[PDB]
């Protein structure tokens, strides 16, 4: 089985997230002022300056594939496997309002839900059969992204992100 | 495009075959006393000794895959792409008479129809995308088989195989 | 979801089967003196005798079922019908018309054929059957399963299993 280790700073964050929604009865305000598209954009910039100035892990092109994979994976996953029972009415209401179709989850949700995906990812990745060489390289790119997510946790996860009607 | 060269001894044989059926109005007697299953069995024996004693080419296991491919390919192909307009009533009558299902074309037809397949094969092989290394090895194994078929043409193709009914 | 009810005589048999292999550490002797090909051929005869004295009295429709079973089994066995212990046996058995690997149907018997009826609903869900054709088919499994239950003593001798 596949394991994707979560930085304990973000493990806590996930526990907080849970407490807020199904106990303190709160919801992330949608759309997030800073959505998943922009979070991902930000990482790529950060990745590119890092590879250039430092000391597969350095391959900026390989990074971009990961990021794109993430936003596709999220778009599909969110309404199926990443919601809490309480968050259901919000989703329905949000997607109901290019050709006047339903905006994709990536443009509406933020860091809170993106992180949730990293919990489900191993099971999903198990189901598509990755080659050895490609999987390791990918899993490493998640670690880097998670490290990035932990390193700037204060900026990506403001408490004021949550709501109460 | 893929080319499978036919030994001119067998090219003639194919021209004879044609003349017999839609001009001299003749039909191969079915089932053939010597069917395609046995022809193929014969080649494998001959391949195996011609390796052990001599002087992908000499690979007895690789040969066996080819032969098995041929009998699957033929079974499927015959009633679709290998018959002449006149031969249609014969096919219907033949298959109509393990669990009392329709005997597969391989157990009914012989050298006459097997050869026809080598005309259509390039078309068919184009449609399944073979890798470079595997295709060349395969095409060579057809040449050897065709060589074998030409070398013993008198035995495999008796004129008495055809009928007036 | 599709359900194929198993006669409780055969439900027990399946529980016995399990206990033998991964607890009492036993294996069906292969090849079975009476394999799946012959079991299936036996049913067809004793479907046709039964018929003599529109729906599921169609001997032709019966034959399609039986042939489907032997194709489905051939494919299914090494993937979804083995127990972890039975793996080495499969490898050894298939390793020994053109000197290819004999198909599972000519090697295995009533023990494994029955296992398939547990997995079948799942598999049949994945190929989209028409309403009219599925019901007719499911009924033909019931008949076969009753047949299998009716002669359970003959098809399932205990001596089918070994220590070695």
């Amino acid at each position: 089985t596949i394991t994707i280790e979560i930085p304990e700073v973000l493990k806590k964050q996930l526990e907080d997230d849970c407490y807020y929604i199904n106990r303190r009865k709160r919801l992330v305000k949608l759309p997030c002022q800073t959505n998943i598209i922009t979070i991902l954009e930000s990482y790529v910039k950060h990745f590119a300056i890092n590879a250039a100035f430092s000391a597969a892990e350095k391959n900026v092109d390989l990074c971009k594939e990961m990021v794109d994979g993430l936003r596709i994976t999220f778009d599909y996953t969110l309404p199926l496997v990443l919601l809490y029972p309480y968050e259901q009415a919000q989703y329905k209401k949000v997607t109901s309002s290019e050709f006047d179709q339903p905006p994709p989850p990536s443009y509406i949700y933020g860091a809170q839900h993106l992180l949730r995906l990293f919990v489900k990812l191993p099971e999903i990745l198990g189901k598509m059969s990755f080659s050895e060489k490609n999987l390791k390289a990918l899993l490493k790119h998640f670690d880097l992204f998670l490290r990035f997510l932990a390193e700037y946790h204060d900026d990506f996860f403001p408490e004021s992100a949550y709501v109460a009607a | 495009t893929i080319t499978i060269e036919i030994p001119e001894v067998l090219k003639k044989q194919l021209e004879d075959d044609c003349y017999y059926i839609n001009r001299r109005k003749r039909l191969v007697k079915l089932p053939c006393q010597t069917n395609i299953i046995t022809i193929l069995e014969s080649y494998v024996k001959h391949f195996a000794i011609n390796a052990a004693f001599s002087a992908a080419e000499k690979n007895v296991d690789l040969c066996k895959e080819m032969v098995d491919g041929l009998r699957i390919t033929f079974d499927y192909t015959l009633p679709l792409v290998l018959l002449y307009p006149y031969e249609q009533a014969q096919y219907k009558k033949v298959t109509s008479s393990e669990f009392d299902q329709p005997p597969p074309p391989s157990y009914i037809y012989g050298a006459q129809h097997l050869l026809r397949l080598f005309v259509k094969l390039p078309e068919i092989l184009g449609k399944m995308s073979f890798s470079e290394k595997n295709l060349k090895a395969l095409l060579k194994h057809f040449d050897l088989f065709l060589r074998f078929l030409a070398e013993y043409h008198d035995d495999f193709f008796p004129e008495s195989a055809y009928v007036a009914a | 979801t599709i359900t194929i009810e198993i006669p409780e005589v055969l439900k027990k048999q399946l529980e016995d089967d399990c206990y033998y292999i991964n607890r009492r550490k036993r294996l069906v002797k292969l090849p079975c003196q009476t394999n799946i090909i012959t079991i299936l051929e036996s049913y067809v005869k004793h479907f046709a005798i039964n018929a003599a004295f529109p729906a599921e009295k169609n001997v032709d429709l019966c034959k399609e079922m039986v042939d489907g079973l032997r194709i489905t089994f051939d494919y299914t066995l090494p993937l979804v019908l083995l127990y972890p212990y039975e793996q080495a046996q499969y490898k050894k058995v298939t390793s020994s018309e053109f000197d290819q690997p004999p198909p599972p149907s000519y090697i295995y018997g009533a023990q494994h054929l029955l296992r398939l009826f547990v997995k079948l609903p799942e598999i049949l869900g994945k190929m989209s059957f028409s309403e009219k054709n599925l019901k007719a088919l499911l009924k033909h499994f019931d008949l076969f399963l009753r047949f299998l239950a009716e002669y359970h003593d003959d098809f399932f001798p205990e001596s089918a299993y070994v220590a070695a």
Binding site: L62 | - | E64, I71, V80, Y83, K119, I123, F129, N133
Partner: peptide, 29 residues
């Protein structure tokens, strides 16, 4: 590695009048 990346209807295996689905290996229970 530099990418996670690298057309004809085909004949299927048919049983009971329908194509056989591919199955991922699994221990029987």
């Amino acid at each position: 590695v530099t990418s996670f990346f690298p057309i004809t209807p085909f004949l299927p295996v048919v049983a009971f009048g329908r194509p056989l689905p591919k199955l991922a290996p699994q221990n029987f229970e």
